[PDB]
Amino acid sequence: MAREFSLEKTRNIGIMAHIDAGKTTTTERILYYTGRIGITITSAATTAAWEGHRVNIIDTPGHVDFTVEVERSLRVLDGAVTVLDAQSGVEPQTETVWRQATTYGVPRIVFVNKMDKLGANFEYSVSTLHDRLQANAAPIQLPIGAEDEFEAIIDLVEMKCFKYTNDLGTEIEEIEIPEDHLDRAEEARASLIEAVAETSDELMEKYLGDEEISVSELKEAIRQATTNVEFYPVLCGTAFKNKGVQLMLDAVIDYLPSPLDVKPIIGHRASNPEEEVIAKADDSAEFAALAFKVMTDPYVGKLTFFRVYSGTMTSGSYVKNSTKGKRERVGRLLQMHANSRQEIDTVYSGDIAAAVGLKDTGTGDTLCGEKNDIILESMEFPEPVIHLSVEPKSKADQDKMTQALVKLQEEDPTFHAHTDEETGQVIIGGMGELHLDILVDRMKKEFNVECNVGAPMVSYRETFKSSAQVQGKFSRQSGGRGQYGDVHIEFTPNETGAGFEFENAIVGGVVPREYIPSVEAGLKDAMENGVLAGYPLIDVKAKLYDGSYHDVDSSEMAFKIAASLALKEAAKKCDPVILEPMMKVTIEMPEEYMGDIMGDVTSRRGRVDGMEPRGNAQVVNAYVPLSEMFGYATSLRSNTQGRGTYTMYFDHYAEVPKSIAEDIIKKNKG
């Protein structure tokens, strides 16, 4: 009938932070407080009510291995609460999530958790916000007490102190600020006002006039700056001991935006990709929503969690999957609460819900009205950083393995699986060692496909280092009509990357013009098979300069065999060598780790091509063997405290060292 909460009262927020910062604890406390006048997290997004406002909460993982979840949640979320450990402030994964939120233009409020922990330092945490992140963040509260002494929070906007008498989170005393901390509170309020004025010109003039800022005016200025993503309010508390959670929820209501306050969304028509459609938060508009999560619930079946941007949609109706270009029957609509799931007949713009019954709808898909044909902007996820050759222990489960891989790829955009033609192995790519390990265990148990993983095999190549004239003669004339072929070919090392080059220096028709293409084909076929270790021969110039032919016996196959024999003799005489792929690796990291990165590069048998500043970090360019690049992400993260990132692409082939080439030859022989 009528939506229980308006667009102005709806709040979509995500909790994000470094590992173990307290995301889950904060989410649990939020749900507990919202659900009072057995909290679980299996639901992708939880719906609650706070002070007449609907709040959708998505709790995110911290590990860089699971950055896909953060990406896909920030895509559909409106605001974020960034939790910081009080003792350490901003950490590497704090930086990563902050950068993702900045890329998606999501307003954020910082929450300094773990104030009760030994070493807690609110000032240090704020300073880390300023330095590590380069963020215009200012406190809107001050903690009275640190560690076990932490007992009160001074709201600076209204200069009011709250005292917590117990860890139960109840019986909070609203009192006036103590005199000893009054001066510090006033200084903090002045700093906050200056920080907001740096973004607001009118407030800047009002403050320069020395007039007293109204509470409402200051709150409006903070809301404007936050929603513009120019200011970051910083709060403090301890979710474990129930201090500051109510204030954090109040700040969420006051400063984080609504589906109206957020910037609009742009999409493309299916038939008119160039056409641009703006999907504003309007119930009366056509229905367009983005499916951001897909899971399976053992009781209701497949759940498709989607966020509605524009329009409305009622359960028991038909929608269009524009991305797939098909029709979907929305049979049931569910919303997950702290303790139970509730069936809801309608979903309006700016709501996160779950559809039951959708088939062939994946994350990032658009669900639009049947008549409409809009397609919202999808999500771009990082490319794999680690690759492993996987293989089932029992070949009888290979089909199960393929199906499991497909399902896992559908469930997780960042996990990829592909077959390598040259080596034939199935390679799994992921965001990190932890990601791939979790996926392997999941395949072993959930799908009952036991698999073993290893370093992927590297496809090598061969080449001729020395030139030589050679002759191939194949003469089987034992009886009747026989088989004759003769060639004299000069093999020369071609310039690397130039490929195979066949030259026809035949004079006088010694080799009939009919058979020359056969000679070239024989050379190509014989070079495909390796002459030293079975790997393809490349970058060679073969000049057919002389030969013989018997008119009755000579034939295409005979000439191809002669060319192959010539190639064999040339391999004997030209000292072939083994080449290996060399990757152009670009490593970006803070300058303080440049020495470690370059040392690791040279230890990987690569060479440092150069260095150059970029933004506030450094970039190192190097060439490393693909074989030696195995497991590079883990080493890079250990060297850079998780702050380093890299890319690698094929660059060229280079000669393998003596010992490595001998080992490869021995392995291929036996």
Ligand X SMILES: CC(=O)O[C@H]1C[C@@]2(C)[C@@H](C[C@@H](O)[C@H]3[C@@]4(C)CC[C@@H](O)[C@@H](C)[C@@H]4CC[C@@]32C)/C1=C(\CCC=C1CCCC1)C(=O)O
Closest CB to RNA among residues 165, 314: 314
CA dist list (Å): 11 to 14, 103, 284, 360, 427:
10, 20, 20, 29, 41
Per CB under 5 A, 24 contacts Mg ion: yes
Bridge partners of 647? 586
CB closer to ligand GDP, 150 vs 464: 150
> Among ligand GDP, Mg ion, RNA, none, what does residue 113 contact (CB within 5–8 Å per kind)?
ligand GDP
Spatial CA neighbour of 78 closest among 252, 310, 266: 252
* Residue 128 annotated as lining a ligand binding site: no
Burial of residue 366 (number of CB atoms within 10 Å: 0-12, 13-18, 19+): buried
Structure tokens at 155: 């709201």
Helix (H) or strand (E) holding 72, with range, is helix 67-76
State which residue, 16 or 110, has the beta carbon closest to Mg ion. 16
Which strand ranges, in their side-by-side order, compose the sheet holding 451-454? 416-419, 426-430, 386-392, 451-454
Show the site string, 405-444: x = touches ligand X by CB under 6 A, - = not.
------xx---------------------x---xx--x--
Site string for ligand GDP, 100-139 (x = CB under 6 A): -------------xx-xx----------------------
Q: By CB under 6 A, which span of 55-63, 215-223, 333-341, 565-573 interacts with ligand X? A: 55-63
Which residues are CB-neighbours of 121 under 8 A, at least 6 positions away?
A: 86, 87, 89, 146
Among 9, 10, 11, 22, binds ligand GDP (CB under 6 A): 22
Contact with ligand GDP (CB under 6 A) among 7, 21, 152, 531: 21
Residue 331 contact, options Mg ion, RNA, ligand X, none, Cβ 5-8 Å cut-off depending on partner type: RNA
Q: How far is the CB of 112 from ligand GDP (least distance, A)?
A: 9
**Least CB distance from residue 66 to Mg ion, whole Å?**
11
Question: Between residues 144 and 334, which has the closer beta carbon with respect to RNA?
Answer: 334
Question: What is the C-alpha end-to-end distance of the chain, expressed in Å?
Answer: 76
* Residue 494 DSSP symbol: P
19 binds ligand GDP (CB under 6 A): yes
547 phi-psi bin (left φ>0, alpha ψ -120 to 50, beta other): left
**Is there a contact between 313 and 330 (Cβ–Cβ < 8 Å)?**
yes
d(CA 436, CA 453): 9
> Least distance (Å) from ligand GDP to the CB of residue 14?
12
20 interface partner picked from ligand X, Mg ion, ligand GDP, none, CB below 5 to 8 A per type: ligand GDP
Instruction: With beta carbons less than 8 A apart as the criterion, state whether 226 and 101 touch.
Output: no
Preceding residues of all breaks in the chain (C to N beyond 2.5 angstroms)? Answer: 37
Q: Helix axis angle, 245-255 relative to 23-34, nearest 10°?
A: 80
Q: Could you tell me the smallest distance in angstroms from the CB atom of residue 77 to ligand GDP?
A: 17
Q: What is the DSSP string of 469-480?
A: EEEEEEEE-SSS
Nearer to ligand GDP, 83 or 386 (CB): 83
Instruction: Please name which of 222, 243, 87 lies closest in space to residue 153, comparing C-alpha atoms.
Output: 243
- 160-164 vs 79-85, strand pairing mode: unpaired
Residue 17 annotated as lining a ligand binding site: yes
Of 145, 167, 169, 144, nearest to 154 (Cα)? 144
Whose tokens are 């999808």? That residue is 378
Which partner in ligand X, RNA, ligand GDP, none is near 535 (CB below 5 to 8 A by kind)? Answer: none
Q: For the CB of residue 296, give the shortest distance to RNA in the complex, in Å.
A: 7
Binding partner selected for residue 299 from RNA, ligand GDP, Mg ion, none, CB under the kind-specific 5 to 8 Å limit: RNA
Question: 575: annotated binding-site residue?
Answer: no
Residue 443 annotated as part of some ligand binding site: no
CB of 402 to ligand X, least distance (A): 17
Which of the ranges 23-31, 320-328, 343-351, 606-614 carries the binding residues for ligand GDP, by CB under 6 A? 23-31
Q: Which residue number, 57 or 636, has a Cβ lying nearer to ligand GDP?
A: 57
Interface with Mg ion (CB under 5 A), residue from 9, 23, 29, 241: 23
Residues at the contact surface with ligand X, assessed by CB under 6 A: 41, 59-61, 66, 69, 411-412, 434, 438-439, 442
- Which segments are annotated as binding site for GTP? 17-24, 59-63, 113-116
Residues at the contact surface with ligand GDP, assessed by CB under 6 A: 17, 19-25, 62, 113-114, 116-117, 238-240
